[PDB]
Amino acid sequence: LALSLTADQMVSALLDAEPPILYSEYSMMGLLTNLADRELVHMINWAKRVPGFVDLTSHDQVHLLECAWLEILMIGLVWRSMEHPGKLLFAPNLLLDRNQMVEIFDMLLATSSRFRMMNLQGEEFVCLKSIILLNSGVYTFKSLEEKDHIHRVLDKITDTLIHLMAKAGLTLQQQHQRLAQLLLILSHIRHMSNKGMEHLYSMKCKNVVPSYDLLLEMLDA
Amino acid sequence: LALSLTADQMVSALLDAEPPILYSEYDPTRPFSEASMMGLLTNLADRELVHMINWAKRVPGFVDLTSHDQVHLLECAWLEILMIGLVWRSMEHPGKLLFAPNLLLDRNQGKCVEGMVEIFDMLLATSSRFRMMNLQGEEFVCLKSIILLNSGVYTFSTLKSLEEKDHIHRVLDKITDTLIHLMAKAGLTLQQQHQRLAQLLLILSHIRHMSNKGMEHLYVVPSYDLLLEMLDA
Ligand SMILES: O=S(=O)([C@@H]1C[C@@H]2O[C@H]1C(c1ccc(O)cc1)=C2c1ccc(O)cc1)N1CCCc2ccccc21
Ligand SMILES: O=S(=O)([C@@H]1C[C@@H]2O[C@H]1C(c1ccc(O)cc1)=C2c1ccc(O)cc1)N1CCCc2ccccc21
């Protein structure tokens, strides 16, 4: 069914699957871990709604989640903070400036400024967040049939991004230029995820990273 | 004048700029130890680096940047650039990484450095992906230039600094134009063109991942001062 969707159907699906913006519950690391943990529960249920994701085996679903989770968290943060220059909107009651580790903060800030400079639209945002889910773990995996399916869904999402842009009036040159601009930021999101994951470790927080079994269990629930 | 180039002139510039293929040390002691394999790899990478700076200086637009920004882009990109070169050299050697014509390593050989094998498998997967896609040489040089300009652009305050970033993004747009031109010229439909562009750019995210994972183990890394001195020479 996912491969028969039109660009409008794809966008409508992803917009309806969007998680809500959560609040923090009242240390800073404690507040952020608690927020991320509640965000993770919504992310599984969002992932199940990304067209094509539930066609994969449970093992492959876990592997993609297991690789994309912090990138998804981060891209959501950068989206939330777009309209707050100089600050990261972890939650509406948890808005941070740099003075409040700083290297990654600055990288997140730069990404928000870039989305702002590009006038990133929410319909584009949801497509990119789906791309991360399906792409981040695909090169590190039935497996053949599974990878083929993932790449066909990814092509569907490209088509949808191009359709969105054409509908907005972008020339053909502009469509491809913007498509390349958006995807290249995904290489910066990966970078930031890997450094975040390195920073979690150096803070002695290797325990907050969701394990394969946690994801599998959350997904079977 | 970099942004005045046509697509055909960009491809020609990038092809002419390609670095040479170097050899590894001749007849090393085999089987390798951890230390010895690392030694060989470090020595090869150190010598590749010099030619990488020569190549970088010929990537259109690169020398319009300040020396400080040129070094910053190379600090961020060098390992990704070495890795994409490795993956390209290895396309026609499934299951194997052609570090040099005289250093062709399979997976079991990666195990000799604890933790290496996981990056080894990622590199082999990327080479299989390029084979599956029938990556063309002209496309490869465009990709490798994208990594140089993009990897460090987001971590550059002043009018000049915004002009530097704007210049980088404009050159990146030109290379996008060039990739599309190559694809259209090959006969791909518009739909195919956009799909193939996305597929190529998404592989860049994986190469970044591998570079992050390998840099972690490096912690060998070329210093700011080394790169600056090489750039002025
Ligand atoms: O890289 S960080 O360690 C990590 C990435 C991002 O910020 C942190 C975090 C997180 C993830 C899962 C955890 O269990 C706990 C924390 C992130 C995050 C959380 C929710 C969200 O919706 C989006 C992103 N980091 C650097 C910059 C600022 C900062 C301040 C305090 C502590 C850490 C950091
Ligand atoms: O990703 S790795 O860090 C990096 C990729 C490739 O293998 C390594 C290497 C390299 C780079 C610079 C060095 O000074 C030394 C080694 C590589 C290399 C790639 C292209 C090229 O043209 C020349 C060298 N890595 C995996 C394999 C074994 C290994 C063992 C210990 C820690 C890391 C790794």
Length of chain A: 221
Q: Given CA atoms B40, B46, B52, B54 in this order, what sign does their dihedral have?
A: negative
Nearest to A97 by CA among A111, A113, A81: A81
Nearest to A82 by CA among A124, A130, A118: A118
Nearest to A190 by CA among B122, B212, B129, B124: B212
Burial status of residue A36 (CB atoms within 10 A of its CB: 0-12, 13-18, 19 or more): middle
CA distance B164 to B162: 5
| A107 vs B contacts (CB less than 8 Å) | 154-155
Q: Say if the Cβ atoms of A131 and B201 lie within 8 Å.
A: no
- Three-state DSSP class for B120? helix
Ordered by start, the domain boundaries in chain B are: 2-232
Ligand 1 probe mutation, A22, A25, A32, most atoms within 8 A of CB: A32
| B173 vs A contacts (CB less than 8 Å) | 177, 180-181
Q: Say if the Cβ atoms of A183 and B193 lie within 8 Å.
A: no
Elucidation technique: X-ray
In ligand 1, which atom is closest to the CA atom of A73? Answer: 23
CB atoms within 10 A of CB A74: 21
CA distance B50 to B62: 16
Min distance A42 CA to chain B CA atoms (Å): 25
Q: Say if the Cβ atoms of B172 and A180 lie within 8 Å.
A: yes
Residue A140 token pair? 């590190």
Residue A110 token pair? 């730069």
Residue A54 token pair? 């539930």
Contacts of B133 (CB under 8 A, 6+ apart): B196, B199, B200
Going from the Cα of B138 to the center of ligand 2, the distance in angstroms, rounded, reads 25
> Is B48 marked within a binding site?
yes
Going from the Cα of A33 to the center of ligand 1, the distance in angstroms, rounded, reads 7
| A177 vs B contacts (CB less than 8 Å) | 173, 176-177
Contacts of A155 (CB under 8 A, 6+ apart): B195, B198, B199
CA distance A124 to A164: 8
Residue B108 token pair? 């079991």
> Is B47 marked within a binding site?
no
Q: DSSP readout, A61-98?
A: HHHHHHHHHHHHHHHHHHHHTTTSTTEEEEETTEEEET
Measure CB to CB from residue B194 to each of A135, A179, A195 and give the nearest one: A179
CA distance A215 to A210: 7
Going from the Cα of B216 to the center of ligand 2, the distance in angstroms, rounded, reads 11
Tell me the residue ranges of DSSP E strands in B56-215.
Answer: 96-100, 103-106
CB–CB contacts below 8 A, A to B: 95
Cβ atoms of B32 and B109 within 8 Å: the answer is yes
| Residue in the structure block whose two tokens are 């608690």 | A34
Write the CATH number of the domain with boundaries A2-220: 1.10.565.10
Nearest to A122 by CA among A64, A76, A159, A184: A76
Min distance B149 CA to chain A CA atoms (Å): 11
Burial string for B88-118 (b: 16+ CB within 10 Å, else e) reads bbbbeeeeebbbbeebebeeebbebbeebee
Going from the Cα of A32 to the center of ligand 1, the distance in angstroms, rounded, reads 6
Ramachandran bin of B187, using left for φ above 0, alpha for ψ from -120 to 50, beta for the remaining angles: left
Q: What are phi and psi of B34, to 5 degrees?
A: -50, -65
| Residue in the structure block whose two tokens are 């390209």 | B88
Cβ atoms of B113 and B142 within 8 Å: the answer is no
CA distance B210 to B207: 5
Nearest to B94 by CA among B125, B60, B61: B125
| B150 vs A contacts (CB less than 8 Å) | 184, 187
For this experimental structure, what is the resolution in angstroms? 1.7
CATH 3.40.50.300 applies to domain B2-232: no
* Cis peptide bond upstream of B31, omega within 30: yes
- The alpha carbons of chain A give a radius of gyration, in whole angstroms, of 17
CA distance A36 to B15: 46
Contacts of B40 (CB under 8 A, 6+ apart): B24, B25, B28, B32, B103
CB hemisphere CA count around B63 (13 angstroms): 12
CA distance B119 to B215: 11
Q: What are phi and psi of A79, to 5 degrees?
A: -60, -45
